[PDB]
Symmetry: C6
Subunit: 218 residues, 6 copies
């Protein structure tokens, strides 16, 4: 990554054994559960495009996903080139060449160049731009790998309301690759078991999730 030292300079620092292992374990243990994305973004704080490629490439399984991710990255890189053509000609002294899409993805750029861009004044945050593409791709994969439609989540006859709401929102989160309406509100009440369904209908519209859960406790 690129971190701030004691003298206040932005310097390069080797990616750590802790970080490498943490990311590899997360993938092994949680596959593409939604929460894996916030974890990737945090573990890659300050990352260079090289560091980002290191983290992706250390993943052993899930090659189908890794391959989809490559395609998404290539799309974004092409889009970037469309919007940011590169000028022919020589670079002025004290200046950096302009980054192509493949430069931002660390494919055609060196570490020195990546560092050059990230610590230039003004900076070109190639690490943060690349990270945004990767996260786009990761979101697609999370939605795809979502194991259950929200329509199939229905409260067991003897299942506590909390356990059912847990299943509901865990499922909802995977389907949109997001934690962010009236439709789901109606669907949640609709799929509750008989006893709860009536009590909930009784609270009327505009009830907070807190009120609903208090209402159906045991």
């Amino acid at each position: 990554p690129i971190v701030q030292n004691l003298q206040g300079q932005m310097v390069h620092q080797c990616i750590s054994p802790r970080t490498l292992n943490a990311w590899v374990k997360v993938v092994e243990e949680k596959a593409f559960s939604p929460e894996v994305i916030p974890m990737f973004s945090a573990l890659s704080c300050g990352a260079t495009p090289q560091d980002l490629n290191t983290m992706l490439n250390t993943v052993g399984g899930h090659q189908a996903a890794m391959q989809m991710l490559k395609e998404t990255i290539n799309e974004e890189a092409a889009e970037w080139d469309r919007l940011h053509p590169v000028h022919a000609g020589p670079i002025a002294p004290g200046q950096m060449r302009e980054p192509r899409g493949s430069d931002i993805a660390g494919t055609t750029s060196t570490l020195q160049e990546q560092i050059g861009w990230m610590t230039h004044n003004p900076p070109i945050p190639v690490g943060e731009i690349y990270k945004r593409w990767i996260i786009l791709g990761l979101n697609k994969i999370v939605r795809m790998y979502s194991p259950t439609s929200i329509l199939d989540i229905r409260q067991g006859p003897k299942e506590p309301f909390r356990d059912y709401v847990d299943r509901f929102y865990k499922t909802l989160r995977a389907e949109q690759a997001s934690q962010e309406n009236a439709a789901t509100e109606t669907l949640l009440v609709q799929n509750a078991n008989p006893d709860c369904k009536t009590i909930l209908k009784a609270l009327g519209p505009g009830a907070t999730l807190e009120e609903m859960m208090t209402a159906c406790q045991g």
Copy 2:
């Protein structure tokens, strides 16, 4: 987080793998037991609103709770906006929650002179929300805690305060009232103003 370095300067620093992991494990292991909150506060020492969202979002289960927490944060953001409708732009509620603000801006508010402590403000909302969840996820009402006939007084007091914590006068009044018959008389005998130590010695 934003830390004082060794040269005495205030700067941004990446949230650490150690921190990330500790928080996730605490939630896996202890769910929403009351002691999780002091731990959250301490693991998020110096946190930006970004860092706070990272900690929350890395949680995998408990989506019901996480969803309740979101609603609470929204209420607080809305209430903040109501109290606040070459000079610096002040944070909307959603800015403090890191939804509509950048890291750059967050660092901006927190290190301004005078600072607007968006980290600390946001952390307060989150802790409000967490306290509600702790209260909800509590197995028993304090009224259902009553000393077993063969249950040692210490074990009963443990259950009493464990339960109470998960939820001033509800103490002294209720603890003695729900003690078993033998202890209850001895305790009412010590009269008022007895220390917990004295009570526990009495019913050993």
Copy 3:
């Protein structure tokens, strides 16, 4: 905690995940065995009253003990106020030292003032007083009930003897008398004869070598 930076100033530093976890695990694993106290004191090196409260509050079980501890702290705070009645710097009330009515900024102010008012160290003293009470109470055995098994090795018996003694928290004179009266007296038959044989004035080392 408050530690020293490179400019030589005493600066505030966030309590670390390693410290937080260590303390919580010690309580889970050892409850209120006597050695838990030296460990608390070391894990809280350089602590602010805020840090101190964090360590206590992260404990999940033992709420009876935690409650007794709050009472002890209140006693000490009141005693402090009694002994300290109301460009001169303002001094700490009892509840300021306990971090209940003071901010981190104030706590840092007192601790790094010249001369310092070590609110962290003062608060830690009160906490350790309370912890000592709890260790004494949670001691499972009276020293009088420690007797060598017929087939129990002398070392294992002496271990139980002194761990029990340490938890009860005898004064040196009492620890001596308890040793003199009780240790040889309560040894199993075989060892008791051999030990009486070494005569008076034998060191614990000598005794333990003898009965190995």
Copy 4:
């Protein structure tokens, strides 16, 4: 390794117990699966030739592979010597002796010389050069230790499309020791080797379908 301190200076630093152990464990656990190479590259960030030899030599098993690796290194060192004849003559004041192939592989050079070259201005990155040779050797080993041909990967009759695509690309990756494999040939072969139900649906989406589209289709 050679790292940047807080003063912004490049200095030598001892290889850490964490790095040593991570690398040894990776080899024990994943042998020569393709993802071991990006991991080696990262664990050896800033490595001197000495550090690189340490990491290789701490591997206990796989002596066949370690032996092949030595041969690959020797080839590259010879090739280096061929292209960089160390010119005879004394060493100019404030320069260093040019590196022979065995100098880059840390066989005939000292830590001091290695540090000399790596922190010179301009630097001669003997660490990064050596690392390149090592990775060439490793890539050969990965391709050799690959069990299956890509031609033997066909979707089970009741095997989910995702599981089949996983095996397809895992295998393709080991065979080339690379993830840059999706050309038109593999694109045709993926659809060709799908089970009957999927094969029809896929042919239906027509040409130019993204892997995401294909996988949604056969879910």
Copy 5:
């Protein structure tokens, strides 16, 4: 401990959670096997008397040993006092053991010029006491180590020297018959290496 920092200064630093735990676990796992002592010495590098007491006091079991150790310390402190009954006050025995001195004073002596290494002096006494305990807790006399009839020479030598070490020519004597003859054959002045190669 008192350490050398980055700016080349000697300063006090808190004992670390890693060090605290490493020491406690070593005692839990190895008790008083001889190798525990080198480990104690290394884990207490740069230790103040206060740090030394922390390390000792965090041990939960082995209170018999901890009590013996206390006695050994008192002996050494008394001996120290006996040998020593802008002029800097010198430490008494109980000052070195951190019983009657403050961290401030401990730091004063240790960083004075020239230093009075109360840390290192105290560590010397503690290690004396630990050695005694190691000797006592040695399960077997060296005289009872005799090569099994079926036991490989190496395993027997391992037991021999593990025992001997704990307790601070007879080796050939107690070897099994086959080895005993071959060894007496190599004659006197044989290296342990030579002996072990011989009985492989």
Copy 6:
């Protein structure tokens, strides 16, 4: 160890719990397998004689080996005295020197690397132990009838490395012995490749 600070000076720093533990575990887990030596060398980077003695003395088992090692160190220290405040043999082995003396020498200009000198003696001793503790002659390594060539070459070179405490073993003798002891099917294919075949070529051939 002795490491570099921020002012660019070489300073003493306490050996870390991690380093201590790593070494002790390696010995517990791998005993005296050959790869233990490159691991010791690395874990003792920048070590003072003091640090080296610490690493050695923290080993609990293998006292026979530890005892041989002590003898080897003595021989080397005597030899050093024969060939020679300036350091005697026992000074380099940290027996009769203080940490302060050890630090002077190592950070002097020019340095006298008593750490690196002591480390070389220790590694001499360890190599002897590695060779002694080796279980199997290279002559007894022969390819199973159903054993894959790679597995056989693995065993071959594993064994060769322990016997010599070295990986520089591929000479013409071992080259002849490797092909000779291959199973019938592979033996013929290998003889077919003719002389001067690389190990890579041989392994591709018998896959």
